[PDB]
Amino acid sequence: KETAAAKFERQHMDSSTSAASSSNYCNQMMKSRNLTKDRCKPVNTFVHESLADVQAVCSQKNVACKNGQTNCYQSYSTMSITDCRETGSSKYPNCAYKTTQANKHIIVACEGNPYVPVHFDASV
């Protein structure tokens, strides 16, 4: 079992490290958060901010989700994130990723009560 909101923290939150760790961050993180379990998840983003900072984006700038829903919110501030991007030669079960660190605004979809992030939509 697993709530959508737990899944968001599992998939997208890394507050313990405040930037990317190293060339191997993505390889390590995609495995340990279990994003290489069934296949090689081709792309994923990690957010190095506090939980409370990320959850607060649910009350920041309301924008359209890529799927046309209306419950997406963009961060007023840039955030430290790491994009993990599965390489060409990555072959499951040996999933291999390029680690890009950047500071970008994030876009998340929020739901529930409390109203919290359930989906990482984009970064800009």
119 labelled catalytic: yes
> What technique was this entry resolved by?
X-ray
Q: Resolution in angstroms, to 1 decimal, for this deposition? A: 2.2
Phi, psi of 43 (to 5 degrees): -145, 140
Domain count of the chain? 1
CA dist 46 and 9 (Å) reads 9
**Residue 31 assigned as binding residue:** no
Catalytic residue among 8, 9, 12, 25: 12
**Residue 39 assigned as binding residue:** no
12 labelled catalytic: yes
Check: CB of residue 31 under 8 Å from CB of residue 10. no
Which DSSP string do the residues of 47-70 spell out, in sequence order? E-S-HHHHHHGGGSEEE--TTS-S
CA dist 63 and 80 (Å) reads 20
**Residue 66 assigned as binding residue:** yes
Place of tokens 């890394």: 14
**Residue 62 assigned as binding residue:** no
Indicate which CATH number applies to the domain containing 54.
3.10.130.10
What is the domain extent for residue 34? 1-124
